[PDB]
Amino acid sequence: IVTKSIVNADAEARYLSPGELDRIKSFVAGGQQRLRIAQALTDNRERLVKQAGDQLFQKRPDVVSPGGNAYGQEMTATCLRDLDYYLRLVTYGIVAGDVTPIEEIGVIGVREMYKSLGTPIEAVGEGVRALKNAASTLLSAEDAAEAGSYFDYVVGALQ
Amino acid sequence: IVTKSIVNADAEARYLSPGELDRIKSFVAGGQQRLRIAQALTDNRERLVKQAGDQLFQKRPDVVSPGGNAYGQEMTATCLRDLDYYLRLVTYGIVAGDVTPIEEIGVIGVREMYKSLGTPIEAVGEGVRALKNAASTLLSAEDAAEAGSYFDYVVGALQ
Amino acid sequence: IVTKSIVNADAEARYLSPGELDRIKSFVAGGQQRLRIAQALTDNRERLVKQAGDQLFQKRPDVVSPGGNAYGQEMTATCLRDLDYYLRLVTYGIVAGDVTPIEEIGVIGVREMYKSLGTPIEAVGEGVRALKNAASTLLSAEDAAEAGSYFDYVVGALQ
Amino acid sequence: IVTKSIVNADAEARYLSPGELDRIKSFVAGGQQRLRIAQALTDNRERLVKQAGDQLFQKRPDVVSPGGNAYGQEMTATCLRDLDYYLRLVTYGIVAGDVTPIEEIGVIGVREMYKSLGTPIEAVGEGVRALKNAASTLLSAEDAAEAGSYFDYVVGALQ
Amino acid sequence: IVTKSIVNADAEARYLSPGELDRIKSFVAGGQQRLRIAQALTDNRERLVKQAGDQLFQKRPDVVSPGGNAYGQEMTATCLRDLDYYLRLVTYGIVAGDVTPIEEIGVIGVREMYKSLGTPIEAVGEGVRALKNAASTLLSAEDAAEAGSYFDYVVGALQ
Amino acid sequence: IVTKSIVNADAEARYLSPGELDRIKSFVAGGQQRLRIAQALTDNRERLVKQAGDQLFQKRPDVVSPGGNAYGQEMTATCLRDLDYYLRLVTYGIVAGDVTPIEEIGVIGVREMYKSLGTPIEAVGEGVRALKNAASTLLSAEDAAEAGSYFDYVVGALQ
Amino acid sequence: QDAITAVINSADVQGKYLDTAALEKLKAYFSTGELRVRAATTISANAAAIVKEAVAKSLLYSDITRPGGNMYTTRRYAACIRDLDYYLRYATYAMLAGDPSILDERVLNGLKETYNSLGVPVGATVQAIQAIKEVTASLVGADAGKEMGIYLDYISSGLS
Amino acid sequence: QDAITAVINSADVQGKYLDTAALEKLKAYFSTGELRVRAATTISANAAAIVKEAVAKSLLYSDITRPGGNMYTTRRYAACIRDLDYYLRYATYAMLAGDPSILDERVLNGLKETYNSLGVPVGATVQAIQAIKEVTASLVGADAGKEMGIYLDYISSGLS
Amino acid sequence: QDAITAVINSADVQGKYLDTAALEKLKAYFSTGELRVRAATTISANAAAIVKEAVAKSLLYSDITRPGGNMYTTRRYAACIRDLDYYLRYATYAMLAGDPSILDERVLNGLKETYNSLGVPVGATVQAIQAIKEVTASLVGADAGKEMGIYLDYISSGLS
Amino acid sequence: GPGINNQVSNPSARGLAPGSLGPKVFKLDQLPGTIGKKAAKGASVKFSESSTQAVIKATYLQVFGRDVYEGQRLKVQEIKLENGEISVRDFVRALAKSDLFRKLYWTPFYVCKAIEYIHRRLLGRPTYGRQENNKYFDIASKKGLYA
Ligand SMILES: CCC1=C(C)/C(=C/C2=NC(=C\c3[nH]c(/C=C4\NC(=O)[C@H](C)[C@H]4CC)c(C)c3CCC(=O)O)/C(CCC(=O)O)=C2C)NC1=O
Ligand SMILES: CCC1=C(C)/C(=C/C2=NC(=C\c3[nH]c(/C=C4\NC(=O)[C@H](C)[C@H]4CC)c(C)c3CCC(=O)O)/C(CCC(=O)O)=C2C)NC1=O
Ligand SMILES: CCC1=C(C)/C(=C/C2=NC(=C\c3[nH]c(/C=C4\NC(=O)[C@H](C)[C@H]4CC)c(C)c3CCC(=O)O)/C(CCC(=O)O)=C2C)NC1=O
Ligand SMILES: CCC1=C(C)/C(=C/C2=NC(=C\c3[nH]c(/C=C4\NC(=O)[C@H](C)[C@H]4CC)c(C)c3CCC(=O)O)/C(CCC(=O)O)=C2C)NC1=O
Ligand SMILES: CCC1=C(C)/C(=C/C2=NC(=C\c3[nH]c(/C=C4\NC(=O)[C@H](C)[C@H]4CC)c(C)c3CCC(=O)O)/C(CCC(=O)O)=C2C)NC1=O
Ligand SMILES: CCC1=C(C)/C(=C/C2=NC(=C\c3[nH]c(/C=C4\NC(=O)[C@H](C)[C@H]4CC)c(C)c3CCC(=O)O)/C(CCC(=O)O)=C2C)NC1=O
Ligand SMILES: CCC1=C(C)/C(=C/C2=NC(=C\c3[nH]c(/C=C4\NC(=O)[C@H](C)[C@H]4CC)c(C)c3CCC(=O)O)/C(CCC(=O)O)=C2C)NC1=O
Ligand SMILES: CCC1=C(C)/C(=C/C2=NC(=C\c3[nH]c(/C=C4\NC(=O)[C@H](C)[C@H]4CC)c(C)c3CCC(=O)O)/C(CCC(=O)O)=C2C)NC1=O
Ligand SMILES: CCC1=C(C)/C(=C/C2=NC(=C\c3[nH]c(/C=C4\NC(=O)[C@H](C)[C@H]4CC)c(C)c3CCC(=O)O)/C(CCC(=O)O)=C2C)NC1=O
Ligand SMILES: CCC1=C(C)/C(=C/C2=NC(=C\c3[nH]c(/C=C4\NC(=O)[C@H](C)[C@H]4CC)c(C)c3CCC(=O)O)/C(CCC(=O)O)=C2C)NC1=O
Fold this sequence. Notes:
- The PDB classes it as photosynthesis.
- The entry lists the keywords photosynthesis.
- Cryo-EM structure of cyanobacterial phycobilisome from Anabaena sp. PCC 7120.
- Chains A, B, C, D, E, F are Allophycocyanin subunit alpha 1.
- The organism of A, B, C, D, E, F is Nostoc sp. PCC 7120 = FACHB-418.
- The structure is cut from a larger assembly and holds 6 copies of chain A (159 residues), 3 copies of chain G (160 residues) and 1 copy of chain J (147 residues).
- Chain A has helices at residues 2-11, 18-43, 45-59, 73-96, 100-106, 110-115, 121-138, 141-158.
- Helices cover 78% and strands 0% of the residues of chain A.
- In chain A, α4 packs antiparallel against α5 (100-106).
- Chain G has 8 helices and no strands.
- Chain G has helices at residues 4-14, 20-45, 47-58, 74-97, 101-106, 111-118, 122-139, 143-159.
- The chains are: A mainly alpha (159), G mainly alpha (160), J mainly alpha (147).
- At the C-H interface, α8 of C face α2 and α3 of H.
């Protein structure tokens, strides 16, 4: 969020306006809660990928069906690896406080990648929704709100 | 500060990124302290213009001198009215949280106005510095810092 | 209500409607109670007029001020006679059910008249409001709603 | 009937005259009987269309005859659907208290419609007369009078 | 008079005095006439209250003035209800012979009450005086002395 | 007076008839006397408002009385400000030579304004009459005639 | 003008209020107003049949409906129907008001000059109005029939 | 349109008969019509006093009635009183109809076009309608003042 | 403009300092900003689903998507989706600003000119914005759906 | 009004009713001052006049659009129409030749804009094309607004 304000005041010839300094000071204050939320999502990763695969393959069985992409153990392992990647990028966005280092690695060219891989993007969005539900069950209320923030950004991005 | 983020995300085709939503939520939280600082500068306007004229005419006596612009009671009344205007715009910038509604009314064309009025701009900058010193004496430490923020913007703008 | 229904069915080419005949039947059924209200207002003419006029002079002392219109015994006697006239027209309207007797005897050209007499309209209206309050206190409750609503027509039509 | 008085007093610059307020209060009083009559005609619709088709095809057999319009099951079903439409509009006019929302949907352009459909309008008038007779048998005396009111309007309108 | 005699002999250590037993005997002997006076005042509730209130508004037009408290139909209805309450307490005191029912139902804290209601005390008192005059005109002569002296207690205790 | 003749000949398709050119030439000749009369009424304004308030509050004391509108220093200051406005419009009509630019600003909707302000219009007419008397004392005979012209128009207009 | 507004106007020209003589007139008007309402319903029932029976009794098969008469043409026959329909409707209004002045002011203002200028015969209209009077007196009743006939004869006397 | 006419229209465009929810809506309207009529009567009593109190609350002694303001000229003051009387009268009509469609059809149709053409200040008009709403909610009571304030706030929201 | 910037402007053009009514307005805005931000987040979640549901509610299976209609050509269907996404996005901006001035400045400026130039049907657009408003008021809740529907109805009213 | 009697459609249905979709019309009936034949003329109520004053209200309402202020009612033509000589179309003609109508709808506007707006007021419909337009504008060029 510091790079955001820096390039924001850098396109202008002005310095960083002190309201931006206030938002940087407030983010610096909230960084400890951000780090605890990121560590709580860090250590419990395989539970979240398990419950996300659970809720997704209960929701959409066509990836399980042989016409779909995630058919067989190798393809379903690649599917849960993709969900692991997106959980990792969500933890990066939780620490960074703003969605730039997660959009730069997971969002900015995802539609043409998944189009030329054959997979549907709506099933990936449902998988990140299942990750958001499982992390909402894992965390407290003020933690699940702040995690569902960035999970919500990914779900809106994949659609 | 909401118009800043809105036109900032509006030049792009993207929505408001949730880091900007975090800065809006933090400004919404700090708005009560902003309102108290603005009311404290509001009710004590007479004192601040008096001490600013005090410190300015002690600092630069050429406006008092008949070759300068602020010679006589009418011209010195117009001078203190200008300082009153700048204190009013500083209170607007304190409430708005970002320097746009004060630069739009007091900064953006001030150099050619004061050039075609004959007055020097450095004396106006010293007057806003005197206003900043008097408001620093009037407020507490965390209030004087946040007032000297926008006063500092005006002093940098008039130079 | 018979004259108004007849002229309204006269403007059209058709007869009197079943709805309008129900209106005439209900008006006949309530006519005896309206004659009772007219009996009470006829027999309370003196004290109602005097209490309403004195309530007017309590509210508005400008008329009985020596710059005012109702200055002197004869002028104030004509003031009370005007209030008597309006109470008489209110009784006519309570009996008829129309406001056409109130209108074409005392409403239709009263503004130009009291403009040429020098008399303020609003004080007439306040006196008729005092008549409304007095006759509301004298009568039975929803009977007073009936009387005061014709009084309300006179008050709203005078202003 | 409220829209009638409102546009009636709206063409004039005057307010709603209180005789119109009396007719609105009386319609408001009779609305419960109107609602009971409309529900009684509502729940017994298929009986009324059956007896109307009975009395019409006994009265005029040319719609049954192959030169007429209502020949065959499809055309006779469209015929009874038209009678159903007119019964529905009669219930609307019974609730509304005045024939505007039924003339706006069933009367105002019916002659050219039935002329460019080939059907005679007198047979439709006889069908609404049969509906009036069947509803007169279905209701009590004061209900059949008030239903035969709007049925009578439709019969006069189709001629 | 039995309660007051009992508590007065309770404050002392002794029984009821022969004088006090003569008082109770005379009160029993006059009790039937007091029930007759209560019968007349019960049956004349309406017109006594209305005549007394209208005599009050003849004397004091400040309450029904628009700056006054009893401005409007509802406020003046509560005014007449207050006069009804006080006439009811006067009948209770005429029956009991004590003024302890009048006192502990309607006298003891009425000044602070009507101070907090914004209502003037003296106009209440003038209305109860009008009740005294009206009930004095209705009853028999020394019977009216009896009724008006309890009314006199209420009038003197309100002020 | 030139706009009067121009729209007068403009409703017709004809040019300005040369009798209208004669009246414009005569007004052009008298314009110097008009300008001197307007300057004489201009520089002596506060005397005229003082003597007008003098003669009005001597004539009608109800505006002074608390039931009237001009009660208190603020309301009497608004009253003398209204008289100042009317003197200003009279000077405009003296220069323009015809009563159009004074009726357009002070006459054309004054009755409903003063009716919905509560003030009587006859007292305003007496105030303009007092202004006419004071300006008649201030000017010479041929000047007071030509000023009492437009003052007379205002006095006739307010009635 | 009603009978009520006529009573009020008479008392207003006197300048007094409504005491017992005017009140007794109003009680009389209320007592007849019940049967007046019933007669208005039974007249509005079959106004078309009343006009049809009246023209069939009086105007048909005569010289005026023959070629060379005032009622020969189809627009003239329709004007005749609408004029008799009017006379019935305004006699109903004047019956319910209990007062013939509204009827006079409505139609007898200019119908004399109109029937003069158009060449409409007066006596055939008087016969048609009398036939309306007989048909409504047979249809409604005795006393409401003569109440209707008072205003119908008022129309017929105003045209003559 | 009415609330009755809106219910009939919503039942009509489906071809639906009057089901029980529409009968509930009509019976709720027939319940509320009592205070609707009483509120309309007492608002028709003293509309001029309401407009006078509203301009004395909001618009008077500002810069708007000073020279340079939009209410300086006396024809512009009369036009201001006319516009406020229009807002109050059409809000009375929409209150008695129980449906704000007449506000959309007769007032709010081309009004922002006119007020931006003439240079009429919109925010001062909104505050004047707000002062109208406070005065009539005080005058009529809270229970009918809610329904009056709904249509006055409808005018204020459509104006902005 | 903002609600903050509008309050500051209204205090500025008088030369007035920030009085207590303006501080009330700013504190009400600072109270409502919570649900404003949460509503803007969940509307930014699934804008495509809202537009899809709105065209499935209002515009689909009509004559508009049939040949002869204005949404028949596939570039015109894509332009329809673009216009509805614009309405939803600018309504989100006006909801978070709390002031409809950006709708007047960026959307409603020359839009009727364009829609009457291209022959775009206006009533179908109004019904589509209505379906957008119903879908997002269901999706976000009633309490923020009121403020969303205010600016969507502002777009609908200015369009008509 | 009803659709079916569009003037482009039924040139034989121009004097019809406006229906219940259109606005409500005003016919001057029951002219006040004709009170029977028999000598009287001492009444008070006279219910016809209260309905004739409303026609005079609606004439201002449709030609001027609003009600006129109190000081600018045309009282001479008002009492002349109530007397019985000048008729409603004569009153509309004498109203549209007043100074207030000129200074409100002819003086501040363009000539063609004022002609079109006077067609919106008096005839109640917009002008069809140019066939009416430098026709009424050719008439305006010789005698003026009054023509
Ligand atoms: C961190 C940024 C990042 C992303 C986003 C990413 C995606 C990604 N997904 C892939 C495959 C895949 N992705 C999926 C996806 C899914 N299973 C489904 O049914 C759903 C639609 C979805 C997940 C629930 C599947 C089934 C394959 C194997 C497809 C194939 O083998 O052709 C592959 C190719 C195989 C590989 O090298 O892993 C890439 C590169 N890689 C990255 O480095
Ligand atoms: C709110 C935005 C705003 C600004 C900034 C502003 C400036 C402003 N300063 C002015 C005059 C003046 N301004 C000054 C200024 C000063 N005295 C000095 O010696 C110092 C250099 C300085 C202040 C301490 C003087 C002396 C005059 C009178 C000059 C003259 O009369 O020519 C004038 C012309 C007179 C007037 O109309 O007030 C304007 C418009 N007006 C505005 O509305
Ligand atoms: C039935 C309908 C009717 C009315 C209303 C009416 C009023 C009326 N009021 C008059 C005078 C007056 N009227 C008032 C009235 C008032 N004093 C005030 O300040 C109050 C606002 C108002 C009391 C309501 C006064 C003071 C006079 C005497 C004025 C004078 O003599 O010049 C006169 C002239 C003298 C007379 O003949 O009595 C008439 C005709 N006449 C009628 O026939
Ligand atoms: C609610 C307002 C409303 C009306 C009035 C209405 C009339 C209506 N009648 C129709 C047909 C018809 N209407 C009739 C009518 C009749 N059978 C007879 O012999 C009699 C003359 C009469 C009824 C007893 C017949 C026979 C047809 C079929 C004619 C055909 O198919 O050409 C049709 C065309 C087919 C359809 O779409 O239903 C319409 C639109 N529709 C409406 O929405
Ligand atoms: C049995 C003993 C007893 C008394 C006396 C009593 C009085 C009483 N008077 C009230 C109001 C009132 N009382 C008055 C009285 C008056 N108007 C005047 O100016 C006159 C001086 C006075 C008439 C005597 C008025 C005007 C109100 C309404 C004030 C309001 O609503 O705020 C109320 C509040 C509303 C209510 O509950 O009715 C009470 C409780 N209650 C009791 O239980
Ligand atoms: C140039 C055209 C013009 C006119 C005519 C005008 C009238 C005018 N008179 C007003 C008040 C007033 N006008 C008066 C008038 C009077 N005192 C009396 O007793 C007499 C009846 C009369 C004068 C001698 C009073 C007393 C007020 C204050 C009333 C109030 O505060 O409600 C007000 C409201 C307060 C204000 O903004 O000044 C206006 C707008 N304003 C204008 O711009
Ligand atoms: C029924 C709905 C309706 C409305 C509202 C309406 C308004 C309307 N207001 C107008 C003028 C005006 N309107 C205003 C009103 C205001 N200006 C202010 O400063 C205040 C904020 C506000 C008053 C509260 C003023 C001052 C004018 C005068 C402009 C002028 O005529 O020079 C005009 C120009 C012509 C004329 O008044 O006669 C129209 C048409 N017409 C309608 O049909
Ligand atoms: C931010 C505010 C804003 C809007 C709304 C806007 C609209 C806009 N819509 C357009 C076309 C269009 N707009 C529509 C929309 C519709 N037609 C219908 O039938 C429906 C009722 C409605 C969709 C809900 C269609 C179908 C076209 C295609 C016309 C064409 O390009 O051939 C065009 C022509 C060029 C182009 O799309 O690229 C513009 C500029 N521009 C703007 O800047
Ligand atoms: C000479 C060229 C010309 C045309 C075409 C014309 C059309 C026209 N059609 C109208 C209404 C209408 N037009 C239609 C027509 C249709 N709706 C449909 O669903 C069908 C697709 C289509 C029939 C094939 C309908 C249903 C209305 C009724 C809208 C209403 O009045 O409520 C109206 C509104 C007023 C009125 O009818 O009387 C006009 C002016 N005017 C003209 O001067
Ligand atoms: C008071 C200001 C005013 C003007 C100017 C005005 C002009 C005007 N000129 C018109 C036509 C015309 N105007 C011209 C004029 C010219 N063409 C040329 O070649 C020349 C350069 C120029 C003459 C110097 C012509 C030739 C027409 C005829 C077009 C036609 O009617 O077919 C028309 C169309 C209808 C009609 O004449 O009756 C208008 C309204 N209206 C106004 O209210």
